[PDB]
Paper text:
ER activates transcription in response to estradiol (E2), and a wide cast of other estrogenic compounds, including steroids, phytoestrogens, and environmental estrogens, by either direct binding to DNA, or tethering to DNA-bound transcription factors. Upon agonist binding, the ERα LBD undergoes a conformational change that allows helix 12 to dock across helix 11 and helix 3, thereby forming a coactivator-binding surface called activation function 2 (AF2). Thus the AF2 surface represents a nexus for ligand-mediated control of both recruitment of coregulators to the LBD and allosteric signaling to other domains. We demonstrate that resveratrol is a pathway-selective ERα ligand that modulates the inflammatory response without stimulating proliferation, by binding dynamically to the receptor, inducing an altered AF2 coactivator-binding site, and regulating the recruitment of a cast of coregulators at the IL-6 locus.
The crystal structure of the ERα LBD in complex with an A-CD ring estrogen, which has the typical phenolic A-ring but like resveratrol, does not have an adjacent B-ring, showed the same space group and crystal packing as the resveratrol-bound ERα structure. This was therefore used as a control agonist structure. Compared to the typical phenolic A-ring of the A-CD ring estrogen, the resorcinol group of resveratrol induced a shift in helix 3 via a hydrogen bond with the backbone of Leu387. Helix 12 does not participate in crystal packing, so this change is ligand driven. Leu693 of the SRC2 peptide binds helix 3 between Val355 and Ile358, and is shifted by 1.6 Å in the resveratrol-bound structure, inducing an overall rotation of the peptide. Here, the coactivator peptide participates in crystal packing, but the crystals are in the same space group and show the same crystal packing interactions. Thus the rotation of the peptide occurs despite being held in place by an adjacent molecule. In contrast, the A-CD ring estrogen and E2 had similar effects on coactivator peptide recruitment to, or dismissal from the ERα LBD, consistent with a fully functional AF2 surface.
Numbering used by the authors:
A (entry chain C): 687 to 698
B (entry chain A): 305 to 358, 360 to 461, 467 to 548
C (entry chain B): 305 to 461, 470 to 548
D (entry chain D): 688 to 696
The structure:
């Protein structure tokens, strides 16, 4: 969904 | 959680180590600014900073939250976070805003964009305040974490999470106080300084709300192509 | 300055004594609400409250020491924050409702009458719940309201230092109150921070409310009093 | 300005 969602899950 | 088991010194270390990198602007300093040019640089910078801000995951206690709650806090606080970062690094540049090491803008360059000098003046005023208080790096990282956890905490079967966030917030308060005690401040001076720092967060909220409205107006006017990420962050406030 | 020589207990007394009365709205129970009539009620109320607020500010220690231009600025900056913290305070003992006036107690469903207002009601109600959870005391409330007056417009400005000395005094007062109430040293700084962080949320609600009020004005939904028009104007 | 006048009366 949200780009933010994707960024959070992919955080490094 | 581990966040609550951290000593004050361990909290400061964790926050210091979690600090995002200082990015450069694509700025080419052989070309005068235009309204579009200026907005482009600032928004491009903000978009790249946002990715790195998502730092958030390393803020003690944050990783404990649901993906939903993390999204909410970031959507609420992202511009406040960018702004306090900007004010912090501009501290030793009176009258200027250090957006990046290669993009140092004075007040009058705010006029390059309609309605922006008003925003610049507020950021500059906050910077002067930080300078006046001699704000320390250890205190800054504490304040920025408080913003992340506080700004959207009241916009929430899941009362256990909100209480966890409040326990983490209390720990950060303990950490600020610890730094002030270590710095040799008396009890009265500790409480006074703590109050002073937190009141600045009121002004940072104000600047964010104003900046959000300005960023929105520039969007509608199509005076600048905003990234998909930036548009979604902006959309969350409207 | 007399304000700085005030003890904590004298500070609290002065602030408690300067508290404005709870005013009634012009609510007419013979008629159903419309977007226009509800906006009329709330804005008529805010207007009468403003008059009392102006006179309350004159009694906040240190305020009258400022130039008229500075007093004007602080109030222009903080007026809606001040109205909102008052509303949240008197709504404390009414879970799920905002006690705008004794004869005007509204839940979020009644907020829906006005386009976009339920969002504001929700934020106010959330803040009210927070006060209730913290068991906010009246002495703490009056300190917080005075801090808002002095702080909100202080950075958009010697006198600056004077305002900060006064603000420091209010901090000392808050700590004094908490100690007197039996809070431990650690609990004192923790509660101080919790209370002050609320002010960030109050600022947020004021900015959102200001945009909404301006919106209603620009759609000719409700006529605002000349005073309210000028207070609103100061934010643009 | 009305506010300015009121802060005196
Ligand atoms: C481009 C704007 C000016 C500052 C900008 C910003 C960018 C990067 C930062 O690290 C801080 C701030 C955000 C927006 C907010 C208002 C204006 O549109
Ligand atoms: C009419 C509005 C609803 C709350 C209202 C208010 C009135 C009196 C109070 O004591 C507090 C608040 C002010 C405006 C702010 C947004 C909206 O337009």
């Amino acid at each position: 969904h949200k780009i933010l969602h994707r960024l959070l899950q992919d955080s490094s | 959680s581990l966040a609550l088991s951290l000593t004050a010194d361990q909290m400061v270390s964790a926050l210091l180590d979690a600090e995002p990198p200082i990015l450069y602007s694509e700025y080419d300093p052989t070309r005068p600014f235009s309204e579009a040019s200026m907005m482009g640089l600032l928004t491009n910078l903000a978009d790249r900073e946002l990715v790195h801000m998502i730092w958030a995951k390393r803020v003690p206690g944050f990783v404990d939250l649901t993906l939903h709650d993390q999204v909410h806090l970031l959507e609420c606080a992202w511009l406040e976070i960018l702004m306090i970062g900007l004010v912090w690094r501009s501290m030793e540049h009176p009258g200027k805003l250090l957006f990046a090491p290669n993009l140092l803008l004075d007040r009058n360059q705010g006029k390059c964009v309609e309605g922006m000098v008003e925003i610049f003046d507020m950021l500059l005023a906050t910077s002067s305040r930080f300078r006046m208080m001699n704000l320390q790096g250890e205190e800054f990282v504490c304040l920025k974490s408080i913003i992340l956890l506080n700004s959207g905490v009241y916009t929430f079967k899941s009362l256990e999470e909100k209480d966890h966030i409040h326990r983490v917030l209390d720990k950060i308060t303990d950490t600020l106080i610890h730094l002030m005690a270590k710095a040799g401040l008396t009890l009265q001076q500790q409480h006074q300084r703590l109050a002073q720092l937190l009141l600045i967060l009121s002004h940072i909220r104000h600047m964010s709300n104003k900046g959000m409205e300005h960023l929105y107006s520039m969007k509608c006017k199509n005076v600048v192509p905003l990234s998909d990420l930036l548009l979604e962050m902006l959309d969350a406030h409207r």
